[PDB]
Amino acid sequence: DVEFDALLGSYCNTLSLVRFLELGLSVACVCTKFPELAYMNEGRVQFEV
């Protein structure tokens, strides 16, 4: 009498990653990198209306 325990497979998933600009939400944001942002103190925007 012979006996064996069989390991018959496994399946990983691809952890898919989205872009955030490959997405319809990103019309509402104007995302611009300001890479000195820590060194900023206070900023204003002008509006002549």
Applying CB under 8 A, the residues found at the interface with its own copies are: 2-13, 39-49
The minimum distance between CB 40 and its own copies, in angstroms, equals 5
Question: Backbone phi, then psi, for 25, in 5-degree steps?
Answer: -65, -30
In the complex with its own copies, which residue's Cβ is closer, 23 or 46?
46
The minimum distance between CB 17 and its own copies, in angstroms, equals 16
The minimum distance between CB 29 and its own copies, in angstroms, equals 15
In angstroms, the CA 16 to CA 22 distance is 13
